[PDB]
Ligand binder design. Structure first.
Ligand SMILES: CCCCCCCCCCCCCCCCCC(=O)OC[C@H](COP(=O)([O-])OCC(O)COP(=O)([O-])OC[C@@H](COC(=O)CCCCCCCCCCCCCCCCC)OC(=O)CCCCCCCCCCCCCCCCC)OC(=O)CCCCCCCCCCCCCCCCC
Ligand SMILES: CCCCCCCCCCCCCCCCCC(=O)OC[C@H](COP(=O)([O-])OCC[N+](C)(C)C)OC(=O)CCCCCCCCCCCCCCCCC
Ligand SMILES: CCCCCCCCCCCCCCCCCC(=O)OC[C@H](COP(=O)([O-])OCC[N+](C)(C)C)OC(=O)CCCCCCCCCCCCCCCCC
Ligand SMILES: CCCCCCCCCCCCCCCCCC(=O)OC[C@H](COP(=O)([O-])OCC[N+](C)(C)C)OC(=O)CCCCCCCCCCCCCCCCC
Ligand SMILES: CCCCCCCCCCCCCCCCCC(=O)OC[C@H](COP(=O)(O)OCCN)OC(=O)CCCCCCCCCCCCCCCCC
Ligand SMILES: CCCCCCCCCCCCCCCCCC(=O)OC[C@H](COP(=O)(O)OCCN)OC(=O)CCCCCCCCCCCCCCCCC
Ligand SMILES: CCCCCCCCCCCCCCCCCC(=O)OC[C@H](COP(=O)(O)OCCN)OC(=O)CCCCCCCCCCCCCCCCC
Ligand SMILES: CCCCCCCCCCCCCCCCCC(=O)OC[C@H](COP(=O)(O)OCCN)OC(=O)CCCCCCCCCCCCCCCCC
Ligand SMILES: CCCCCCCCCCCCCCCCCC(=O)OC[C@H](COP(=O)(O)OCCN)OC(=O)CCCCCCCCCCCCCCCCC
Lengths: 105, 313, 114, 167, 98, 96, 110, 80, 70, 347
């Protein structure tokens, strides 16, 4: 009983809050506007069954934009290796990662 | 340096509260054809010191409280929400300059009825609890017209920024386009702080079961609320001339207007009998609230029909 | 997946505009009138490419034309501009409305000399 | 420490929920929920949502918890409380020590162990709060939302006047 | 994902299990229910502010309004039960077994 | 009086917004060189750090695409000191 | 961070004053005593009136919560829709108050 | 309509003032000559950057400089 | 007569005048002779942090004018 | 209750269910459920006795906990998809939470323990509204989110609902609790065919709404609450015993009655998908519902329990009630099986 009254009468009751890529107030972009735009424009009209297996790459990029799991994993790997090489004494921080260097602009 | 600014905020607040009692007793003295205190110090200027040292060495009343924790926390919350109402006040430059200072003051003042409710439940007297519930229902009643009058005034401001409410009133005082909102605001803030002619906690009181020390702490919290609501009314309806090169001009000007307005509280408490409880409930719900909704529709529709929609920034 | 291509720091060296916000704000209208074309070419390239790596030469042209703008001010009208941005810099919100007579002096000196 | 301030306020939020969820009384339940509403408001305020945190203070703790304490204080006047408290606190501090040593934890989903500053954006929004414009779009865009919410509140007034009537 | 999201979800499940194990009071059930609402508010607010999805900034206010009207309805139900029996005990409510 | 003064205030707000608009391309160029500076520095220090670890790709974009992704707060301030991180990650929120 | 320092200072000064006010007059010795209310020992009568005015506050407070972003909503492009929904919400608050009046809701707290 | 109105303004003047203010607030922006200017001011306040257009060759009504004559300007705002 | 209330009101006026004069002189002193930079919106904070980066002394209020460019 | 206020409140209930049905946004689904509950609470308290206040308290707590679980499922969908469309869920855990919340709203087992109490406390017309209208909204949401539902979860809920709603109603003498365990069993039957062919779900929804509508219209027409009060109808009105005979025999699914149609189409669709065992255990369970419907018919219609003397006075007063559509709802609920391929209009 998805009685699609909004498509029948033509009214637009709640399609505007539905997705991030919609017309936002004063054109404010969401942080994943491009990824969700590409995933929606991939999966448009091909149905959900073909969308879950053909538009999988755009949705993996988009979920990684939303939750940033792989990036936090990568930063934890790099920062733990950096902390380990500091603790071993085998590494020194550069002047631009210690704060003595007059940031650019 | 900033801790110096917090201390120079909240020590003169407590001193102004201390001498508001002297200003009260003197001004209510000469309005009752008598003198107020003039024997304790020169011109009575040592009365609150003598009275505070009288209170802090009085024997504690020592009650068996239903809750020890609420009995301790009610003056703590009362004094905390008496001192943290001053921090966004633009006088001329606020301590904590925030974007939503108006909504901050509305929220922190709406939180302060827990002190009344906790101090009333922590007493064993059921009649003290009933009086506390009446005071709570009074204050939460007049919070409604505080919020709507505040909204309808800030439609002329453009934002919730308190410092912008100075820049709004360089041409004219805001009491000229909004004097019905100003007078309903004035009586609604007079009824917020359980101030006469609304003070139904004289008749039992909610904080009469405390000792003399913690009752004095409630008392100085209530007078900080009085001075604060008068300074907020001065900022919001009588915002004065602000030269950014000499800020002491605005400081002297809002100081004079705020002292006249606090003396107007003292001059209204000595002129009218107490509302009975159904009378001020009638006064809110059937007299002040229809006009407040009507003026809220009027101040929504007025910048759209004058083409005078104020700037957000 | 891919190796992300970041340009070298030798491709990011350019002489910066090392002035304050009140200095940029006090000369902002004459900047948007005079430095129009490289600024708009850079923002057109910045929206169309959607990529700051593909916009660095236009960014260097912006950064060079802004410095030419402040050179062409500093040769002529350093004193009225200094008198104007000091008054802009005194304020908290940096109001243009507190500083109208220094604005008249600076715009008069610029319109006469340049 | 200070980078972990949203995490510290989240731990205090969970400690408050274990504090009143063990239910000594509706009075102390309301007390713990007030303290939890304040610290959860602080969690909201540390992401830049100042208006929604002030909606917490003004509406939640301002109207609704005041009416809860108002009804509790005039309509009422353990071992399991302390045991459930220390049980929930041991569960929470086991989770805390796990994510302190491991920088990763899976309860139902997988979770990070970094400071939660790492999930932000580095730009500016010009002359507006983004969230202020989003709530300002309630009137210009949300016609259907305001209609159904205002109709639900009008029927809320009608429903409460029906069922508190007694007859 | 984020760890504060795990703590807000654990707050929701704690007030869930407090709601699913009645001690005596119906007001304690309503307070556990509004703690569930509060954790929903915090979690939705953090997700909506974090993604900069601007049009959902009006969503937590609507959540707060609807569930606070829900709580007012619950308090009126509790007051009718308190008029019937005298307390807000849940062991008074054993009439509909037969 | 409020009509005339709020119209004058709207005109001054449009003046301030157009001063902002005239300054935005220079600030956008400075911002682009800022973020590319910090990503190039973090890339070079990742190169000099991640040499013991096997199977590591320096500069491995975790996305499947070649579109420029806006850099995260942790992708810029990842290796940097905590005072810089706090002044950049809660600076605007905590500012008075 | 200035805000939390100021809140900590005000809360700490209030807690210090409350501790001093409860523990300075305990240093006095004076004596001990026996210490044995319009209503003597009866149970507290539940007032339906107080609860009705609390829920009436809560519902009008929710309607206020809908009314709050109007100073930011006046800045929109879509002024006819904005003004219509604003006057609609204040009229629904007035209909809530009028139904509260005419069907006898505001009784003995009038 | 002239007797009952005097009756209710004799007995309940607050509600008469409320309904009169509310009636003015509803009907008056549809009669005022300035409601056009509120829209014209709000859509002339530039919150965003005016993203320029690629000059394809036939856009005679889009300027090439801010001080060009073509394009929508705000003379009605400075005059009013 | 009535003017005897005026020393109490004068002491109360000084005890309301200390916070305003105090915070104005503190803001003007701790920012080099000028008002505290009001950063309500993130563009103003971006310009403030840009001043703090271009000043070279990690203070936003230390202004650099035309002398800093050529 | 004021009749104008009653019409406004009933239109608010119908508006809440319509808002659940028509909307594409998850918040508007949740708002529709909130409006539904908020307006249905005074329908239960139309008589203002302690049983209705207890029933509305239990109903409010169950639907409120379900609505909080629904909003949590929506919020975790906003985590894992960043969007609000009412379609499949992009998370297994959000699927499990939303299926549990809709199970608490349907009164399916093992969240079924509120259905007989709330059905027993409230009047017959509000019980009719509860057991027919309130099933329309969560079944619409389950109709929309079926590409994410865990198969084992919804089948476990379905068979546990059928077994508890079958093995419960054999003991009962109250008519409303018999209708409540019938509700639990039929919602098990509707959700078991949901992932195989949802047109049969909507078919079972229509035939169940028609049969429960007929039964509560008969129960209002005679004002009967227990088995014995139903069985004393034969001397007051003999035709009503025949109608509850044929309709109670329909609700357990006798051939060739129209209540056999939904579960015959359900076993017809579940064996297409190589499940022979699961509709077999379901049809084995449904025979218990059929048994206590046989027991109720032996009480009411095929025998005549002895009456009192006061019944002779009620002979002289025909029923002055609004029996709205009762012959239509009786004809549809028993003689519809020759029109079994009418089910394609729901596709
Ligand atoms: C499309 C969907 C339509 C759904 C049904 C809509 C109509 C009914 C809705 C309201 C309702 O229940 O009203 C009571 C209901 C009568 O039923 P009742 O309450 O049981 O009355 C018992 C006695 O018969 C009462 O007798 P009485 O003495 O009071 O007066 C006699 C009355 C007098 O009649 C009139 O006054 C009617 C003329 C004026 C009507 C209004 C015009 C404007 O006539 C009748 O009551 C005869 C029965 C009327 C038809 C009932 C069944 C309607 C169809 C239901 C669905 C069937 C689907 C079958 C599918 C099979 C395959 C799957 O309907 C009416 O009074 C009017 C019916 C109009 C039928 C129109 C058919 C075409 C629609 C298109
Ligand atoms: C902020 C600066 C200072 C503020 C002002 C300070 C001075 C004023 C305060 C003096 C002391 C007051 C002490 C408390 C008094 C409490 C009693 C009281 O007054 O109750 C309120 C009384 C209550 O009435 P009542 O109590 O006298 O009578 C009972 C009520 N009836 C008759 C209804 C049964 O009045 C009000 O509620 C009015 C509130 C103010 C209304 C302002 C309306 C302005 C005009 C609007 C437009 C009119 C024209 C219509 C449209 C025309 C279109 C062309
Ligand atoms: C900032 C606002 C004001 C703050 C508070 C006021 C500031 C001054 C605080 C100290 C006041 C003096 C001490 C407390 C009052 C003592 C009153 C009293 O009766 O004392 C007798 C009491 C007890 O004397 P007692 O033995 O006669 O006891 C009376 C009871 N009988 C006889 C039955 C046993 O004195 C004390 O308890 C002394 C306490 C210490 C006093 C200070 C010592 C020096 C500190 C430097
Ligand atoms: C009594 C109700 C009176 C107000 C009705 C709505 C008036 C209105 O502003 O409509 C235009 C508004 C807004 O239109 P708009 O033109 O402002 O929207 C511009 C388009 N967007 C949002 C994409 C920028 O609503 C609609 O156009 C349709 C949505 C709601 C329609 C009304 C539903 C009522 C249901 C009753 C049952
Ligand atoms: C019985 C218990 C104890 C009772 C007594 C003590 C507690 C009660 C009294 C104190 C209440 C504290 C309320 C503090 C929050 C108020 C809202 C707020 O932060 O507003 C200020 C500001 C919003 O303005 P804005 O300008 O938009 O933000 C800066 C960006 N330019 O926002 C900012 O500038 C953000 C500043 C950083 C975040 C501040 C968070 C404060 C700490 C969390 C709450 C602590 C109190 C918890 C308990 C509350 C009461 C139960
Ligand atoms: C398995 C999943 C849950 C695991 C944690 C359980 C928490 C510890 C409680 C164990 C049971 C103790 C008990 O007696 O609970 C019953 C009590 C309500 O019953 P009451 O009347 O108080 O006591 C008589 C006994 N029924 O119940 C309560 O009061 C329970 C209060 C629950 C509050 C939850 C706090 C957090 C618990 C850990 C996370 C879940
Ligand atoms: C269409 C415009 C917008 C309208 C909606 C917005 C309204 C904003 C204000 C909100 C008011 C909320 C409360 C309204 C309730 C009205 C019903 C009512 O109160 O009736 C009872 C009352 C008699 O009061 P009583 O009980 O005797 O009082 C005891 C103390 N003396 O009866 C009365 O006092 C009589 C009140 C009704 C008659 C007043 C007529 C005023 C006419 C002014 C000119 C025409 C204005 C156009 C609008 C007219 C609307 C009817
Ligand atoms: C913003 C402004 C805030 C101002 C706050 C304070 C307001 C009031 C300020 C003080 C006003 C004057 C007070 C005068 C007190 C009496 C002076 C006096 O002469 O007392 C005499 C008395 C007995 O003396 P004796 O020698 O025994 O008598 C025989 C003489 N033939 O001797 C004694 O009793 C002993 C000496 C007592 C002296 C007390 C002086 C007042 C102390 C008040 C504390 C605050 C001081 C000011 C703080 C703010 C300014 C820095
Ligand atoms: C894929 C599917 C899509 C959707 C398809 C459509 C689904 C429709 C489902 C309809 C369910 C109707 C349930 C009831 C609706 C509300 C009407 C009601 O209950 O009215 C109660 C009313 C109370 O009157 P009152 O004055 O209180 O008297 C009581 C004692 N004094 O009055 C009474 O008590 C009067 C007594 C008789 C009332 C009989 C009403 C029967 C209406 C339903 C007909 C059958 C269902 C429709 C046909 C099949 C549709 C699937």
């Amino acid at each position: 009983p998805f009685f699609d009254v909004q498509k029948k009468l033509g009214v637009d009751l709640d399609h505007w809050m539905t997705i991030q890529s919609a017309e936002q107030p004063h054109r404010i972009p969401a942080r994943c506007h491009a990824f969700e735009k590409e995933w929606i424009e991939c999966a448009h009209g091909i149905g959900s069954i073909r969308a879950e297996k053909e538009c999988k790459i755009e949705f993996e990029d988009f979920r990684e934009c939303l939750l940033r799991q792989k990036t936090m994993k990568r930063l934890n790997a790099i920062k733990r290796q950096r902390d380990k090489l500091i603790k071993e004494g085998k590494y020194t921080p550069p002047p631009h990662h210690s704060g003595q260097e007059d940031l650019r602009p | 340096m900033f801790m110096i600014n917090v201390l120079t905020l909240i020590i003169p607040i407590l001193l102004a509260v201390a001498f508001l009692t002297l200003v009260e007793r003197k001004v209510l003295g000469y309005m009752q054809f008598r003198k107020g205190p003039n024997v304790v110090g020169p011109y009575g200027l040592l009365q609150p010191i003598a009275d505070a040292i009288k209170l802090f060495i009085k024997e504690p009343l020592r009650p068996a409280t239903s809750s020890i924790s609420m009995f301790i926390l009610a003056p703590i919350l009362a004094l905390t929400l008496a001192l943290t109402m001053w921090i966004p006040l633009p006088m001329p430059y606020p301590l904590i300059n925030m974007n939503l200072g108006v909504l901050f003051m509305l929220a922190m003042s709406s939180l302060a009825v827990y002190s009344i409710l906790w101090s009333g439940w922590a007493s064993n007297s059921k009649y003290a609890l009933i009086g506390a519930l009446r005071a709570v229902a009074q204050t939460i009643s007049y919070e409604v017209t505080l919020a709507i009058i505040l909204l309808s005034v800030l439609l002329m401001n453009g934002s919730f920024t308190l410092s912008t409410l100075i820049i709004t009133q360089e041409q004219v005082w805001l009491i000229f386009p909004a004097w019905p909102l100003a007078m309903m605001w004035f009586i609604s803030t007079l009824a917020e702080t359980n101030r006469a002619p609304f003070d139904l906690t004289e008749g039992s009181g909610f904080n009469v079961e405390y000792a003399a020390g913690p009752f004095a702490l409630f008392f100085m919290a209530e007078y900080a609320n009085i001075i604060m609501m008068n300074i907020f009314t001065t900022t919001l309806f009588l915002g004065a001339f602000h030269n950014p090169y000499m800020p002491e001009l605005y400081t002297i000007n809002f100081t004079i207007k705020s002292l006249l307005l606090s003396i107007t509280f003292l001059w209204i408490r000595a002129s009218y009998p107490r509302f009975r409880y159904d009378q001020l409930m009638h006064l809110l719900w059937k007299n002040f609230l229809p006009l407040t909704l009507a003026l809220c529709m009027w101040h929504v529709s007025l910048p759209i029909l004058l083409s005078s929609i104020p700037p957000q920034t | 997946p891919g190796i992300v291509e970041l340009p070298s720091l030798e491709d990011l060296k350019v002489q910066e505009v090392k002035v304050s916000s009140s200095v940029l704000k006090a000369a902002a209208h004459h900047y948007g009138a005079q430095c129009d074309k490289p600024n708009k070419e850079f923002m057109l390239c910045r929206w169309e490419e959607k990529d700051p790596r593909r916009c660095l030469e236009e960014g260097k042209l912006v950064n060079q034309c802004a410095l030419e703008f402040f050179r062409q001010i500093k040769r002529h009208c350093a004193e009225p501009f200094t008198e104007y941005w000091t008054c802009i810099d005194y304020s908290g919100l940096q109001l243009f409305r507190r500083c109208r007579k220094e604005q008249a002096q600076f715009d008069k000196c610029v319109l006469d000399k340049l | 420490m200070m980078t972990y301030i949203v995490f510290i306020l989240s731990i205090i939020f969970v400690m408050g929920f274990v504090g009143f969820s063990s239910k000594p009384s509706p009075i102390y339940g309301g007390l713990g929920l007030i303290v939890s509403g304040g610290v959860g408001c602080g969690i909201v305020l540390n992401f830049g949502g100042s208006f929604l945190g002030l909606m917490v203070f003004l509406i939640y703790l301002g109207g609704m918890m005041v009416v809860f304490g108002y009804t509790t204080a005039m309509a009422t006047e353990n071992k399991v409380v302390l045991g459930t408290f220390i049980t929930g606190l041991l569960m929470e501090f086991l989770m805390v020590y796990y994510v302190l040593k491991d920088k990763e934890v899976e309860i139902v989903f997988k979770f990070n162990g970094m400071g939660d500053w790492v999930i932000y954006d580095t730009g500016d929004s010009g002359f507006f709060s983004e969230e202020a414009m989003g709530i300002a779009a309630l009137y210009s865009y949300g016609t259907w939302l305001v209609i159904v919410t205002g109709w639900s509140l009008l029927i809320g007034v009608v429903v409460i006047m029906e069922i508190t009537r007694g007859n | 994902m984020s760890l504060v999201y795990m703590n807000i979800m654990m707050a929701f499940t704690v007030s869930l299990t407090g709601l699913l194990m009645y001690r005596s009071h119906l007001m304690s059930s309503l307070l556990c229910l509004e703690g569930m609402m509060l954790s929903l508010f915090i979690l939705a607010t953090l997700m909506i502010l974090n993604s900069h999805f601007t049009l959902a900034s009006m969503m937590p206010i609507i959540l707060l309004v609807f569930a606070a009207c829900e709580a007012a309805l619950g308090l009126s139900l509790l007051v009718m039960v308190s008029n019937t029996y005298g307390t807000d005990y849940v062991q008074n409510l054993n009439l509909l077994q037969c | 009086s409020m009509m005339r003064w709020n119209r004058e205030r709207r005109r001054l707000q449009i003046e301030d917004f157009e001063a902002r608009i005239a300054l935005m391309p220079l600030l956008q160029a400075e911002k682009d060189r800022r973020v590319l500076q910090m990503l190039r520095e973090n890339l070079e220090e990742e190169a000099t750090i991640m040499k013991d670890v096997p199977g590591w790709k320096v500069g491995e974009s975790v996305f499947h695409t070649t579109r420029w992704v806006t850099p995260m707060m942790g992708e810029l301030y990842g290796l940097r000191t905590g005072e810089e991180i706090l002044s950049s990650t809660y600076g605007f929120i905590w500012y008075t | 961070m200035n805000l939390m320092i100021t809140l900590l200072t005000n809360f700490t000064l209030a807690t210090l004053l409350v501790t001093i006010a409860f523990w300075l007059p305990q240093l006095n010795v004076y004596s001990e005593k026996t210490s044995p209310d319009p209503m003597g020992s009866a149970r507290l009568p539940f007032s339906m009136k107080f609860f009705l005015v609390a829920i009436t506050f809560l519902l009008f407070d929710l309607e206020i919560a809908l009314l709050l972003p109007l100073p930011w909503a006046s800045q929109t492009t879509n002024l006819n829709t904005m003004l219509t929904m604003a006057l609609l919400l204040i009229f629904l608050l007035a209909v809530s108050l009028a139904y509260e009046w005419t069907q006898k809701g505001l009784e003995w707290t009038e | 309509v002239a007797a009952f109105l005097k009756n209710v303004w004799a007995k309940e003047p607050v509600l008469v003032a409320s309904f009169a203010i509310a009636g003015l607030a509803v009907i008056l922006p549809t009669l005022s000559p300035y409601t056009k200017y509120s829209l014209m001011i709000n859509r002339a306040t530039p919150y965003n950057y005016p993203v320029p257009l690629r000059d394809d060759g036939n856009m005679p009504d889009v300027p090439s400089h801010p001080q060009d004559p073509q394009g929508p300007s705000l003379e009605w705002l400075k005059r009013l | 007569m009535w003017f005897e209330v005026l020393p109490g009101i004068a002491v109360m006026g000084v005890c309301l005048f200390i916070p305003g004069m105090a915070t104005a002189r503190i803001h003007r002193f701790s920012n080099g002779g000028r008002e505290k930079r009001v950063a309500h919106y993130s563009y103003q904070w971006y310009l403030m942090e840009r001043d703090r980066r271009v000043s070279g002394v990690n203070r936003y209020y230390v202004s650099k004018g035309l002398e800093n460019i050529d | 209750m004021n009749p104008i206020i009653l019409i406004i409140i009933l239109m608010t209930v119908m508006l809440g269910t319509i808002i659940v049905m028509i909307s594409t946004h998850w918040l508007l689904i949740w708002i529709g459920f909130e409006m539904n509950m908020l307006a249905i609470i005074p329908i239960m308290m139309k008589k203002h006795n302690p049983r209705a206040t207890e029933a509305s308290t239990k109903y409010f707590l169950t639907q409120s906990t379900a609505s909080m679980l629904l909003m949590m499922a929506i919020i975790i969908n906003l985590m894992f998809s960043g969007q609000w469309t009412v379609m499949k869920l992009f998370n297994p855990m959000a699927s499990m939470l939303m299926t549990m919340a809709l199970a608490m709203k349907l009164g399916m087992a093992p969240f079924h323990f509120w259905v007989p109490e709330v059905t027993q406390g409230i009047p017959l017309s509000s019980g009719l509204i509860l057991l027919t209208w309130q099933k329309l909204a969560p079944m619409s949401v389950l109709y929309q989110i079926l590409p994410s539902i865990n198969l084992d979860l919804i089948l476990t809920l379905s068979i546990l609902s059928i077994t508890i709603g079958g093995w419960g109603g054999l003991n009962q003498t109250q008519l409303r609790k018999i209708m409540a365990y019938s509700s639990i069993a039929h919602m098990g039957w509707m959700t078991a065919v949901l992932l195989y062919n949802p047109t049969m779900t909507l078919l079972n929804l229509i035939i169940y709404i028609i049969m429960t509508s007929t039964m509560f219209t008969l129960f209002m027409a005679n004002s009967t609450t227990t088995t014995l009060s139903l069985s004393h109808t034969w001397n007051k009105a003999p035709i009503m015993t025949i109608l509850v005979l044929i309709t109670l025999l329909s609700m357990g699914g006798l051939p060739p009655l129209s209540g056999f149609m939904p579960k015959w189409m359900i076993i017809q669709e579940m064996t297409k998908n190589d499940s022979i065992i699961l509709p077999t255990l379901m049809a084995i369970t449904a025979l218990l519902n059929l048994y206590f419907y046989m027991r109720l018919t032996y009480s009411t219609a095929l025998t005549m329990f002895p009456s009192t003397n006061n019944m002779k006075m009620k002979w002289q007063f025909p029923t002055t009630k609004r029996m709205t559509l009762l012959p239509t709802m009786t004809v549809l609920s028993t003689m519809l099986l020759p029109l079994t391929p009418i089910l394609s209009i729901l596709e």
